[PDB]
Every structure is written in C-alpha cells, then in structure tokens.
Amino acid sequence: PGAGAIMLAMVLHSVGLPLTDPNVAAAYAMILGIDAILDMGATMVNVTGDLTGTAIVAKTE
Amino acid sequence: KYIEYPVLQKILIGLILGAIVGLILGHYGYAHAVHTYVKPFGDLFVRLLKMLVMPIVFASLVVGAASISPARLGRVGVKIVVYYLLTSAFAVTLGIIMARLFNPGAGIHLAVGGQQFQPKQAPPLVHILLDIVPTNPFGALANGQVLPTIFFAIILGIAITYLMNSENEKVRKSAETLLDAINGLAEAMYKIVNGVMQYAPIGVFALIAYVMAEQGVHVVGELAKVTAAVYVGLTLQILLVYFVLLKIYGIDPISFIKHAKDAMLTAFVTRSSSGTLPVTMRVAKEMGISEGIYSFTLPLGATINMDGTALYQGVCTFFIANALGSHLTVGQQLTIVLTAVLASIGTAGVPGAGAIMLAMVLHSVGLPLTDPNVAAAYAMILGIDAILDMGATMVNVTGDLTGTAIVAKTE
Amino acid sequence: KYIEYPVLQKILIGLILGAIVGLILGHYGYAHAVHTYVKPFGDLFVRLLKMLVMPIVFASLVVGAASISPARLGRVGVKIVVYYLLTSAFAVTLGIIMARLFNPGAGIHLAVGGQQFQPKQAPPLVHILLDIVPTNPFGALANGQVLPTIFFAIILGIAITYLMNSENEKVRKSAETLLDAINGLAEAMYKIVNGVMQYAPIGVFALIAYVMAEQGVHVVGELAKVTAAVYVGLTLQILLVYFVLLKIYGIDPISFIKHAKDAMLTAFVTRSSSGTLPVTMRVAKEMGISEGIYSFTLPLGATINMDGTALYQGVCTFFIANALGSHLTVGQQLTIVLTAVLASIGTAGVPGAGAIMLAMVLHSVGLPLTDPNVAAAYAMILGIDAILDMGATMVNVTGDLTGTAIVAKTE
Amino acid sequence: AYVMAEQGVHVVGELAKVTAAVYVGLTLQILLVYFVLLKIYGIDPISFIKHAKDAMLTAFVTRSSSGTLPV
Ligand SMILES: N[C@@H](CC(=O)O)C(=O)O
Ligand SMILES: N[C@@H](CC(=O)O)C(=O)O
Ligand SMILES: N[C@@H](CC(=O)O)C(=O)O
Ligand code: NA
Ligand code: NA
Ligand code: NA
Ligand code: NA
C-alpha cells in the first residue's frame, strides 16, 4: 500500500520540479493526504489488468 | 577606495540594489548561483558581528553593573520585563487583528479532522531558571551562552563595586586595575563594531541578495496574503505602539529612528538578534543611554522580546487554520496570544527559529503537525519564511531599544 | 643538580646520545619497551611547550598589532605571503631535483595501470577563509584554534591603538590597563618558555630515543634512498635558499643559526611547528625582531609555510611513481609542485600530518590510493615517516624565522 | 575476463615470482600427490581428469568451492 505515492517522487524528479522546494513538498503533502483513497481504485485496476493480461494470453495459447 | 561614502547611504544603497539583483536573479532561476557566489560575503558580515558579541556583552555588563546601584538594576529589570511582556502580548493581538482584516489561508480549501492530541505541553521552567546561573563562567563565555554570561557580569560588577568601599586600599587598587581593563575591552569592541559596519554595505547587499533570490518567488497568492498582513502589521507596531510609547515617555520618536538605522538595518538583513547585538548596543551608547541599563536590557531583549516573531506567529497560526477552514474563535484566539508570547520568548535569536517555534503555537490550538494538510500549509509558510524573518527581526530589535530608552528615561 | 651546565650543550648532548640509545635499543628489538619507558619524558616536554602556545600567541599579537601601524601589518603581511609561497614552491622543485638526482623507488619493480579517477578535487577555499573569522574568540582560544585567534588579536591590537587616540582620557586609562596586563601575560610566557627548555635536554633525548627506536631499522634499501634524497634535499634548501636570501638581505647567515638552535632543535625533535612556536617566537624576540612582526609571521607560517613538508611531498610522490614505473615527466612534474605546495600549506602543524597529506598529492597525478601496489609503496613511506618528519619540521620552522628576519629588515 | 583485467598487470618482478612459485607448486601437487595416489589406489589418473574438467574449470574460474559444488 501507497509505495506508489512514494514512487510518485521519481516521476516528479524526472521533470523540472525538485522535492526540496516547500511548495513542491507542500502540494505533495496534500496528495499524501488523499493517498490510500487513490490507492484503492489504483490497486483494483493493477490486478484487473493482470487478469485480463492472463485470460487474453491463454485464449491465445 | 570609496574613499568613504557615508554608511547609511551605502548600506541603504546595497539593500535596495541587491534586493533587485536578488529578485531578478531569483525569479530567473539562479538562486543557487546566488547562494554560491554572493552569499559568503553576506556571511562574512554576520561572522564579524558575532565575533564581538561575547566580549562586548560581558565587558560592558561588568562595568555597567559596577557603575549602577544593585537597587536600580533590580528596578530597571522588573521594569523591562513587565514592559517586554506587555509589548510581546500586544504584537500577537495586533497580528490576529491583521489576519482577521486580511485573510491569508482562507481561499485555500483544505480541511482535516483530528486532534488535540492529547496534548502534552509544559515548558520545564525550573530547569530554564537554574540554567541562567552558569557553573563555569569561563565555560559559558567559551561557547555562546549569553544569558548565563549576563548573570555573571551582573554578579561581578556588583562585587567589584563593593571592593572599592573596603577598608584596605590595596584591594581597591586591584579592583580598579580589573574594572579598568574590562572597560578597556568593552570600549575596544565598540571600536570594532564600527570596523565591521564599513563592511555592512557589502554584507547588506549580499544578504537580501540571497534572501530575496531564494524566497521572493514564493510570495504569491494566499502566501503573498500572509506577507502583507504580517508586514503591514509589523509596521503598524512600530507606529501604533513604539512611537506612541516614545512620544508618551517624551523621547523623540523620529529622532529615535534618527539614532539609526544601523541596528534597525543589521536586524533586518541578518535576521539574527544575537548577531545584531553589537550594533544594537553601539546604538544604545551612541544615543546616550546608560551602560548599566543598556548592557542588560539589550542582551536580555535580544532573546526574551521578539515582538515581530509573536506577530507572525499570530498571523501564521491563522493561515494554517484558515487553509483547513478550522475557525478558531473565542477561546483559541485568546490561547494564541498566550502561547505565541510564550513561543517567541521563547524563540531563539537566530534565523527562522521563530518559524520552528510556530509549531508550539499550532499544537496549542486544535491542529497537530502530523496531518498532511496541516503540514502541507506549514510547508508553504516555510517557503515565505526568510522573507517574513527580516521584518520580524527588525522589530524584535526596535522594541528592545525603545524598551531600553523608555526605561532609562525613568531612572 | 647539573648544577646548570649550558642548554645547547645538554640538548645537543641528549640528541646525539638518545639517537644512539634509540637505534641500539630499536634495532635490538625493544622499541615497544622505549615507547613505554622513555616516551612519557619526550612527551612531558611537548606538553609544557604546548601549554604556552595559546596565551603567548594571543597576548603577543595584541601588543604587536597595537605597537605598529595598521598600514605596516598590511605591508609586512603581503610580503611574508608572497615570500612564503615562493619558498614553498622552490622546495618541491628542490625535492623533484633530488629524486631525479638520487633514484628512490626505481629499482623496485611493481607496476599498476588504472586512473585517475575521475578525480574529484577543489579545496573549499570559501569556507577556510570565512573560518579565519571566529565567532567566539573566547571559544577559539579555549580550544586550540590558532588562525582564528590571530585574526582577533590583530583586530584587538588595532582597536586599542585607536582608543589611546580618543578624546576622553578615561578610556585611554582603561586602554592601557588592558594592553599592559595583556603584555603582562605575553612577557610572562616568554619567561616560562625558558622554564621548560631547561627540561628540553631530557625531552629531546627521550623524543629521538623513541622515533629512532621505532623507525630507524626501516631506513634500508630503497627507503634509505628516499631518506638520503629528502635529507640531502633539506640541508640544501638551508644552504642554497636561506643563507643566500639572508646574505642578500644583509643579515648574517651564520649569526642566524647562531640565534639558535633552540627553535631549530625543538622543530626537529617534536616534529611539531605548533609545539615549537613558543621557542620559535622567543628566538624572534631574543634576536631583536620587533613584536609587531614576529608574533604575526611565526604563528601564520607555523601552519602556512611548510618548506620541509612540501619537499618530502615531492620526493615521496616520486618514490611511489618509480616503484610502479609510472613515469611522470612534463605536465605532472609541474603539477606536483602546485599540489605539494597546496598540500603543505595545507598540512597541519603536528606530527606526520604531512605524510597523511601525501595522499592528496598522489591523486593529483595518475595513481589512486586504492590500488595494492600504490598502497604497498605508501605503506613503506609511513615506516620511514617520522624520520623524514624530523628534518621536514626543522626546515618548516627555519623557513619562518628567515621569512620573518628578512621581511623585518625591510620594515 | 575481469580477474585477468584487474590483476594480470600486477604479475611482475618479485610478484610474478610468487606466481611462478605457487603455480608450478600447484601443478606439482596434481602430478606428485594425486596422479600418484590415483595410480596407487588403482584408479586411472588420466581417465580421472578425463571425468572433467567441468568441476576443474568452474573451480578455477569462480574461485568458489562452494559455488562449484553442484558441478
Ligand atoms: N531570526 C529571528 C527569530 C524569528 O523570528 O524567526 C530573530 O533574530 O529575532
Ligand atoms: N611534523 C611536521 C609536519 C610534517 O611534515 O609531517 C611539522 O610540524 O611541520
Ligand atoms: N577461492 C578459494 C579460496 C582461496 O584459496 O582463497 C576457494 O574457493 O577454494
Ligand atoms: Na529581540
Ligand atoms: Na526568543
Ligand atoms: Na611552519
Ligand atoms: Na600546513
């Protein structure tokens, strides 16, 4: 759970914004407060696409 | 090589210039370049200004407690305290009354729902007290320790004094040799505090160079709203309270700022009351106040009386409760004042420790630091921080000087 | 009970005696027993000689900067600087030109082939300078800190001078009391520095008792050859550079070592410029140099001008390049100079910190320390180290007296 | 590829000589002690290395008895 929210950092760093700047971290924080609420829907489609990835490959094997 | 242009010209010249060099280089993303190249010159300034604090506070206080009555320290003190608290207490309610008039934080919707908790609290008072009495004064000196130094120099000056009215007039010889040389030092340091101060022009340019590059950019929207209510609030303390308390105690308000700036401007750009002190003290002397007063109301004020911190502490505490829509109202409004006085008395005398203190006052009301949106909002303030810190410090100091001058025109 | 046989007899007496007790005790495997039994006496000497460094450096400078014009400090400084750089940069070339003349390391076959890497570099200059300004000068004293101390006593001395030129003749009284009592101290230290130095005969005996015991036996084969190359390189800096710069500046070259040894025989046997300095300074005074010079050019050179270090740092860099067969040639020979200077300026004033710096100079050229045969070769030098360290320090110090006496004959 | 890259160059002077001393010492344990104890115990000395290498060429290159063991 939410290691994706921690990972969100990597993807932030790739573009401009760096984590050190208060308003970067200010916004990220807010997101870290809505996080497991996202994480729910997130995980249900991390797995649903794992099942469709299996079923449609074995329907071809 | 200037050769010597006047200082309050070059000082005020580098201030308005490096503020623009800083803001331009800052908003064009160079603030790191600025923190590489410029910064270390605005450092050397504060470096030299610190270098003096330890002798100049110890020396000047031995002398000044020798050249005043034990009776009168003890009156000037109880005076400065009950004046210090009253000024500090006013600055909070003058902050609440600015975040009520303005509205920073409101208009960023972000509420949250959990407290207190439980919570904790208790400043270990007993230990802070026993602590002003140092156990090696050589020690105390040797590593910062201004408050425990005070309580020595006061004890020493009082004892030398006593040595001079003693029967055997061999000791009164020694008693003089000591107190002369001690004054030798103190006097010397006030000469060095002019030395540095010809460096100030550079140091002042290169300080708001860096402070304006690396945090001007953040003065935006609802954060900008926190600046204005604080700034317009600090420059309302100056006018509504000091000039009034100077006028009332019949000391000239405009001649007072006429003493200056020197310490008003080293307070602003350094954002260090402790680093200011030498300059702060040399504008006590140069304005004629008595040494047995100013060398003990100013090193105590440099920590205990931070009107400018406990103002921003008021209005920052409002911003983070506004951004969450938690309306604070009767009881808390009143327990902000108490605790932001506390939090500033409180704060240390160095850069943005007032902001770190801001945590004690938040936790005092509902909101606790752990809750992401609490912290999200606090983080934002931690980006407008050094910009508040400047004005905060310049009033933390100007309230010390008016405190001094107004107590000493009664004594 | 000697009762008092002459000092340079009894110090030169235990020197040539204890080098023989030590080599006999050490090559017959006892060097442990000698670091048990003898050593605490060679120690107690360096103990006593340290004890003074702090007052004697502080007090004397205050006085010497008071007793001269701010102008002339500024002029004796820039001089001593551009002198010191120049002496140090020759000493590497005179070290290169000795490990070219001898051949230390070549004749041991051990090659390796991986560099640079990348590599790194940049002494943080900004911060070493800003550091010479201490922020607690009580502090700085209270713990070693010689360079920050210098930057105070110079500003204090200068401040006092100005106080004696002030209208109010009550502060001129205080000013005198101070500078007088301060000179009270300085003077006193110079008396105790004779106290010890009657102990030096024992101490010198008991220092090379040990350094020769535990490191003589290693002066063998390719290692003896770096010794010869450095030692013959060192007593040829003395002759070709000092005596020549002394003659030229019209000061008597033989009457100069005739000032001595004292500072020449504590520098050698302590291997500490910092522990010497009391004896280094007392033979600046005793030979008639003015205090407003020697109490500022001897504590600065005590760290900044290390001729004997920057010499063995060139010929040790060679030894390690030759043992690996890594030939250095055009570009590196010149950037050994630059670096072995930097590395000695550079080195700390205490035992074998120069052998520890040798690393910084190895990595400036190809070889990195990690590779087994670089470190194998470096390990051998760490066993000839305190033996090189002796002469090395004796010329670090001798290059500060000459640098002092030749600048003071110009001022 | 690597062990020769980062440690071949050092086999030089007195160091090459411990190499020679060990290496010629090791291929003389093989001959004088194994082949002889194999012969004597009536197992075929050349048919024994003929078992191999496999365990002889992972033992050499891994420098791990523990990592060899499966082979
Ligand atoms: N740096 C401030 C403290 C603060 O308000 O953050 C001062 O010297 O007063
Ligand atoms: N022992 C030397 C330092 C060195 O060359 O290792 C000194 O005091 O100058
Ligand atoms: N690498 C060796 C051990 C050794 O001789 O260093 C082994 O696996 O047997
Ligand atoms: Na203050
Ligand atoms: Na405070
Ligand atoms: Na030296
Ligand atoms: Na050095």
How far is the CA of B344 from the CAs of B83, B161, B240, in angstroms?
Answer: 15, 35, 20
Owning domain of residue C221: 1-411
Percent helix, strand and coil across chain A, each to the nearest 5: 75, 0, 25
Q: Does C175 contact B184 at a Cβ distance shorter than 8 Å?
A: yes
On the question of a cis peptide bond just before residue B119, with omega within 30 degrees of 0, the verdict is yes
**Partners for B (CB, 8 Å, 3+ pairs)?**
A, C
Q: Tokens representing C14?
A: 């235990």
Q: Does B373 contact A30 at a Cβ distance shorter than 8 Å?
A: yes
How far is the CA of B246 from the CAs of A25, B341, C294, in angstroms?
Answer: 45, 22, 53
- Quick one: residue C365, left, alpha or beta (phi over 0 = left, psi -120 to 50 = alpha)? beta
Q: Are B65 and B157 in contact (CB under 8 A)?
A: yes
Ligand nearest to the Cα of B300, by number? 4
Q: Tokens representing B250?
A: 């019949």
How far is the CA of B293 from the CAs of B58, B63, B75, B232, B298, in angstroms?
Answer: 14, 11, 10, 31, 8
Q: Are C381 and C358 in contact (CB under 8 A)?
A: yes
Evaluate whether chains D and B are touching (3 or more beta carbon pairs less than 8 Å apart). no
Q: Please list the alpha-helical segments (H only) found in C238-371.
A: 243-248, 253-257, 263-270, 273-276, 278-285, 291-304, 307-323, 329-346, 353-364
Q: Tokens representing C97?
A: 């030109």
* Chain C interface, best mutation among D2, D7, D15, by max C CB count within 10 A: D15
Burial of C230-265, coded b for 16+ CB within 10 Å and e otherwise, reads: bbebbeebbeebbbebbeeeebebeebbebbbbbbb
Q: How was this structure determined?
A: X-ray
Report CA(C103)–ligand 6 centroid distance (Å).
27
Residue in B153, B161, B162 with CA at minimum distance from that of residue B185: B153
Q: Please list the alpha-helical segments (H only) found in D6-71.
A: 13-29, 36-40, 45-49, 55-62, 65-68
C355: amino acid identity, one letter: A
Q: What is the resolution of this structure in A?
A: 3.5
Whether ligand 2 lies within 6 angstroms of the CB of C306 is answered as yes
Residue in C229, C232, C258, C225 with CA at minimum distance from that of residue C243: C258
Q: How far apart are CA C105 and CA C224, in angstroms?
A: 10
Q: Are C72 and C227 in contact (CB under 8 A)?
A: no
- Quick one: residue C234, left, alpha or beta (phi over 0 = left, psi -120 to 50 = alpha)? alpha
Whether ligand 2 lies within 6 angstroms of the CB of C215 is answered as no
Q: Does D13 contact C372 at a Cβ distance shorter than 8 Å?
A: no
Instruction: Name every chain C residue with its beta carbon within 8 A of the beta carbon of B138.
Output: 138, 142
Whether ligand 2 lies within 6 angstroms of the CB of C399 is answered as no
Q: Helix (H, G, I), strand (E, B), or coil: what is residue B145?
A: coil
C35-39: long-range contacts at Cβ-Cβ below 8 A with a sequence spacing of 24 or more? C35/C210, C35/C213, C35/C214, C38/C206, C38/C209, C38/C210, C39/C206, C39/C209, C39/C210
Q: Please list the alpha-helical segments (H only) found in C133-221.
A: 137-142, 146-164, 171-195, 200-213
Whether ligand 1 lies within 6 angstroms of the CB of B346 is answered as no
Instruction: Name every chain B residue with its beta carbon within 8 A of the beta carbon of A22.
Output: 218, 379-380, 382-383
Q: Does B376 contact A26 at a Cβ distance shorter than 8 Å?
A: yes
Binding-site residues on chain C for chain D (CB distance < 8 A):
108-114, 372-373
Q: Does C373 contact D9 at a Cβ distance shorter than 8 Å?
A: no
Tell whether the torsion through CA atoms of C157, B264, B77 and B337 is positive or negative. negative
* Interface B-C: count of C-beta contacts within 8 A: 79
- Residues constituting chain C: 411
Q: Helix (H, G, I), strand (E, B), or coil: what is residue B52?
A: helix
Q: Specify burial of residue D65 (Cβ count, 10 A radius: 0-12, 13-18, 19+).
A: exposed
Q: Give me the phi and psi of B163, to 5 degrees please.
A: -65, -30
Q: Which residues have CB under 8 Å from B143's CB, separation 6+? A: C136, C139
Q: Are B25 and B214 in contact (CB under 8 A)?
A: no
* Chain A interface, best mutation among B27, B32, B214, B218, by max A CB count within 10 A: B218
| CATH number of the domain where residue C188 is located | 1.10.3860.10
CA dihedral B230, B232, B238, B243 (to 10 degrees): -150
B104: amino acid identity, one letter: P
The ligand 1 atom at the shortest distance from the C-alpha of residue B347 is 3
Residue in C269, C365, C351 with CA at minimum distance from that of residue C314: C365
Q: Please list the alpha-helical segments (H only) found in B106-170.
A: 125-132, 137-142, 146-164
Instruction: Name every chain A residue with its beta carbon within 8 A of the beta carbon of B375.
Output: 29
DSSP line for C43-105: HHHHHHHHHTHHHHHHHHHHHHHHTS-HHHHHHHHHHHHHHHHHHHHHHHHHHHHHHTTS-SS
Q: Does C373 contact D13 at a Cβ distance shorter than 8 Å?
A: no
On the question of a cis peptide bond just before residue C318, with omega within 30 degrees of 0, the verdict is no
Q: Give me the phi and psi of C370, to 5 degrees please.
A: -55, -30
Q: Does C108 contact D10 at a Cβ distance shorter than 8 Å?
A: no
Report CA(C276)–ligand 2 centroid distance (Å).
11
* Chain B interface, best mutation among A23, A34, A38, by max B CB count within 10 A: A23
Residue in B286, B277, B294, B281 with CA at minimum distance from that of residue B68: B294
Provide the number of structural domains found in chain B: 1
Given ligand 1 and candidates B87, B277, B347, which is best to mutate, with the most ligand atoms within 8 Å of its CB?
A: B347
Q: Which helix (H) or strand (E) holds B307?
A: helix B307-322
